[PDB]
């Protein structure tokens, strides 16, 4: 028998990720760098791999999309609401969507989507919020070495992975 | 930090639960019977009690449905997708809704309700898919022709676990 | 070339329902019987006709539901919304979704299935609301003759059928 | 009593689209381009004129989605249903959604995106299947291989039924 573990969490650690769609603001390159790093931020302190799919089901489904897209969380136009997305779990658990009516960018200007994604990707492999006004996971966006409240919180889901 | 902690049980023995709507293959009665009986499985070998509400909101809301249906894990027409369940905690935990595409029945024939009802109630409570291919709790489906059911001792083993014996 | 239809209207005369799932309040035949005096109110004034499918996809998808239950329109609990049906149309088009957390009858008490059915479907073939109080399409429920305003506005959409 | 009068056409010959997000199968210059040849399709032999905006609500919104993407119409994986859009009014009148689960392109490899999105703009302006198998409105997508296109006699006499000549 089994019984469900103790937090919501991927039972793997090889995870794929697929960018549906982009965003008007970035080049596809420039996006997909973007979600490359913000990636890192998490593999690079535990056992997590992560591989992007080209089409198909892939585990983290990122979109950008306005207004209704297809759940429960219609996004707002420009401002408020930026993103989110889901907790670890089948279907629409760990996706990722972004509010295309947001400026997405590659610098300090609008929103920098590599650190709206890592903040994403945290939620979408288990974290929820922190505390810590210095933490990825605070819940307040402000404009790179992942924070120690953040390595933490993700090795204390995953371990660490290799260590060196 | 904060993860997002998981229920494991139920932090109360007596349960409630709804039958909201349902199916058009059975009678009411037929249903009725199906359900009582799938919760007594459990029950019957643990502290667990469950109650039936008619009206109002219960830890466990039974309903059928097809497609999508209200919570984004859409349905899928004949086969394939049978049914699902939350697990233990608020609002849709413990929930269990079955795919009306299917031909739910008492006997063989379709998919026996009882059988899959039990099985998702497994769910509800905590447990997850089993490795044993003799348990209640394994993925696949298998229909033995007996008139009685017998949990096998791997749900036992995990359902107790879980809440104890009876 | 087509261009589209002057009103939102079936293009076919020959239309099914399916009865998806049903109500604890009533049993399973009184249900049929109330959708299929509830259809024929309209069949008996136009060249409509109704055929029940026990499966599948029916033109018209009957089902009773609570609060979310797979559209834009989630019920409300006991009272207030009853019922909602959409316009003709592919997909959801035409469907009807009753409220389940509402006691429905086949009399006086709660709410008539058979009376709230009949003002449901003339939504699910093209008619909105009536301003006259004493229609079917009137907005408010009040508890079989089909009203003149109705007659007028079915038979706007879809001609008489046999007069006889 | 009161029916849903249905918007013949659009009141007015200026009409706004915004391109909301974008494939990854083309560029953003070949998608821009893409759609901008669809439009000039059907203003070139009518008064209607389109313009780009980058922000807000326009006219005609675009996207690309997959399975259920915001309106209970999903789309359903490769193949099957392409794209879909409103006739004329508010709101959702006249949006037009593309199923990025096809492979679009400028080319006769999957699905050309400037061919697609010409049809769906003929129903986002009021024009439903015609039944001339050589008209663009015709239900069944084919691929000329040729470099240009001209509007079909059939499509150019439903759209100006509608709006006049150019
Ligand atoms: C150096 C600090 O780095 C950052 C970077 C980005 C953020 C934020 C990204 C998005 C937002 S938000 O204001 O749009 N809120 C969302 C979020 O925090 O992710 C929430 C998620 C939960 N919600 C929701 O709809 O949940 C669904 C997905 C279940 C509502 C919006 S803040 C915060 C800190
Ligand atoms: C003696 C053997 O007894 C049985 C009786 C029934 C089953 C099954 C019932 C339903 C299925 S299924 O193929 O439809 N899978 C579901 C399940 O195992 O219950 C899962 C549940 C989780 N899902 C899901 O989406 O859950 C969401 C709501 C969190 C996907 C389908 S197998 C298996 C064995
Ligand atoms: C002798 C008079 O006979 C009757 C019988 C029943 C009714 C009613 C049935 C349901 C209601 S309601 O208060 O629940 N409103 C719904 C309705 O009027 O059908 C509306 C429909 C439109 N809505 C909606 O969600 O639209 C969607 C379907 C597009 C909101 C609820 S009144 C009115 C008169
Ligand atoms: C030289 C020939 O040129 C063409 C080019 C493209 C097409 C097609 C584009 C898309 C399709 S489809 O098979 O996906 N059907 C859709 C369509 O015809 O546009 C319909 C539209 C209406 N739908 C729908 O659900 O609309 C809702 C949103 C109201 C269902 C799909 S065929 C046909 C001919
Ligand atoms: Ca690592
Ligand atoms: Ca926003
Ligand atoms: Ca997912
Ligand atoms: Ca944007
Ligand atoms: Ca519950
Ligand atoms: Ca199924
Ligand atoms: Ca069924
Ligand atoms: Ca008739
Ligand atoms: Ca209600
Ligand atoms: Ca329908
Ligand atoms: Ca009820
Ligand atoms: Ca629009
Ligand atoms: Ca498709
Ligand atoms: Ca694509
Ligand atoms: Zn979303
Ligand atoms: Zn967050
Ligand atoms: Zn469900
Ligand atoms: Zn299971
Ligand atoms: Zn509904
Ligand atoms: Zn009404
Ligand atoms: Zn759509
Ligand atoms: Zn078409």
């Given at each position: 028998?089994?019984?469900?573990?103790?937090?919501?969490?991927?039972?793997?650690?090889?995870?794929?990720?697929?960018?549906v769609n982009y965003t008007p603001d970035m080049t596809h390159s420039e996006v997909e760098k973007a979600f490359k790093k913000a990636f890192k931020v998490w593999s690079?302190?535990?056992?997590?791999?992560?591989?992007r799919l080209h089409d198909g089901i892939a585990d983290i489904?990122?979109?950008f999309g306005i207004k209704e897209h297809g759940d429960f969380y219609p996004f707002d136009?420009?401002?408020?609401?930026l993103a989110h997305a889901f907790p670890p779990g089948?279907?629409?658990?760990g996706d990722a969507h972004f509010d295309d009516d947001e400026t997405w960018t590659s610098s300090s200007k609008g929103y920098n989507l590599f650190l709206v994604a890592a903040h994403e990707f945290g939620h979408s492999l288990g974290l929820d919020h922190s505390k810590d006004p210095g933490a990825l996971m605070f819940p307040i966006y402000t404009y790179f070495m992942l924070p120690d409240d953040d390595v933490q919180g993700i090795q204390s889901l995953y371990g660490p992975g290799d260590e060196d």
């Amino acid at each position: 028998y089994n019984v469900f573990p103790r937090t919501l969490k991927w039972s793997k650690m090889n995870l794929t990720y697929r960018i549906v769609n982009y965003t008007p603001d970035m080049t596809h390159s420039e996006v997909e760098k973007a979600f490359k790093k913000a990636f890192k931020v998490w593999s690079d302190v535990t056992p997590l791999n992560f591989t992007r799919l080209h089409d198909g089901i892939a585990d983290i489904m990122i979109s950008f999309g306005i207004k209704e897209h297809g759940d429960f969380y219609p996004f707002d136009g420009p401002s408020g609401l930026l993103a989110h997305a889901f907790p670890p779990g089948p279907n629409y658990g760990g996706d990722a969507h972004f509010d295309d009516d947001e400026t997405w960018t590659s610098s300090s200007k609008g929103y920098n989507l590599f650190l709206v994604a890592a903040h994403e990707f945290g939620h979408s492999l288990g974290l929820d919020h922190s505390k810590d006004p210095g933490a990825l996971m605070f819940p307040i966006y402000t404009y790179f070495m992942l924070p120690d409240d953040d390595v933490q919180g993700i090795q204390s889901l995953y371990g660490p992975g290799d260590e060196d």
